[PDB]
């Protein structure tokens, strides 16, 4: 967005009460490493977090 914090003072953000998606992650910037531990990226929109 504009700027993020360091790792020792890790930046925390709270998100709820909205719709999330993974296919919308490939428009504003192309990512390099994307690993969802234990969860396949194709099913994330099919579960309700």
């Amino acid at each position, epitope marked *: 967005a504009t700027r993020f914090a360091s790792v020792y003072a890790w930046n925390r953000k709270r998100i709820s009460n909205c*719709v999330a*998606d993974y296919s*919308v992650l490939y*428009n*504003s910037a192309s990512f390099s490493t994307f690993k969802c531990y234990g969860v396949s990226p194709t099913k994330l929109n099919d579960l309700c977090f």
Partner: antibody
């Protein structure tokens, strides 16, 4: 810094041509918005200039063969070689923005939000 | 040369609700959606206050709204103030990503 600035204003006579320009500052015109709204005070308006680059079939059936315009992305400025200027085109234009659907501003929706304009130039076609 | 019907003269008391419309045809009734309403103090570039008719502009006072049905319209301007004596328009589709809109409803605030 981010601003649309109109430039290249001069006198136009019947039978002549002139190269207008709308220069974006801050944001490069390669991946940004440009909408040329033509305003005459007191009455209705019209959006006319149909230049979205790639050079395919997209045009309005009112200015066929009159308004010719080119594209220059890296220089962050667009030039308007408005040829065959008619004397009944007394209006101050504005290059502006819009909104589509891709980025975080729209994930579900339509878009279409002109939000940043220019200041316009004063070009009169007089005999 | 392309121009659609709008109610030019509209007026309402402060704190009331007024309705603004702009005309289309039967080729615009099945299932599209593109309507964004304008705002102009006369003599300069417009201002955005309402778009995505029934949803949220980023920074805008939530006193204004819009409502959508059939041939029955509303740009619902509510909570009128002394600064609402401004020009208004809509937006609309014309088919195959083309565009058209209405003829400039002008609001005058009384009282």
């Amino acid at each position: 810094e981010v601003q649309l600035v109109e430039s290249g204003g001069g006198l136009v006579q019947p039978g002549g041509s002139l190269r207008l320009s709308c220069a974006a500052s801050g944001f490069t015109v390669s991946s940004n918005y440009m909408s040329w709204v033509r305003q005459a005070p007191g009455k209705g308006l019209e959006w006319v200039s149909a230049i979205y680059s790639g050079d395919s079939t997209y045009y309005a059936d009112s200015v066929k063969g009159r308004f010719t315009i080119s594209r220059h992305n890296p220089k962050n400025t667009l030039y308007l070689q408005m040829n065959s200027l008619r004397a009944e085109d007394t209006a101050v234009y504005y290059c502006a923005r819009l909104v589509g659907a891709l980025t975080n501003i729209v994930v579900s929706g339509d878009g279409g939000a002109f939000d940043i304009w220019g200041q316009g130039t004063m070009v009169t076609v007089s005999s | 040369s392309y121009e659609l019907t709008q109610p030019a003269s509209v007026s309402g008391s402060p704190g009331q609700s007024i309705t603004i419309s702009c005309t289309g045809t039967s080729s615009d009734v099945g299932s599209y959606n593109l309507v964004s309403w304008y705002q102009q103090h006369p003599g300069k570039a417009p201002k955005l206050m309402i778009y995505e008719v029934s949803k949220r502009p980023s920074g805008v006072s939530n006193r204004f709204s819009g409502s959508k049905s059939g041939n029955t319209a509303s740009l619902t301007i509510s909570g009128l103030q002394a600064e609402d004596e401004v020009d208004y328009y809509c937006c609309s589709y014309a088919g195959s990503s083309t565009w058209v809109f209405g003829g400039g409803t002008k609001l005058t605030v009384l009282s």
